[PDB]
Amino acid sequence: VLPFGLTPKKVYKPEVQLRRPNWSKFVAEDLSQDCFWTKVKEDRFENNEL
């Protein structure tokens, strides 16, 4: 059970390993209640052609 009602993210399985950017990620414990990152609805941008 993630904090602030968050669902777990979609774990992708690419066939080819890609070049990746390596940032310092924020977990759901690092986020606050009224932040931008709890309201992220990125699955509307999902496309298999992309």
Partner: protein, 49 residues
């Protein structure tokens, strides 16, 4: 100090240890790089045409 603390609650950005000019510079440099990348894509499409 209150309005900067009001900025510290909307975006968190570690408010105890964050200067203000470094955060605005990275937003400015990303803004100039994204505007350069759009014009480079327009120049690449003009060359490919």
């Amino acid at each position: 100090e209150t309005l900067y603390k009001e900025l510290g609650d909307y975006f968190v950005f570690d408010p105890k240890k964050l200067s203000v000019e470094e955060f605005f510079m990275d937003l400015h440099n990303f803004r100039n790089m994204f505007l350069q990348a759009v014009k480079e894509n327009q120049k690449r499409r003009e060359t490919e045409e």
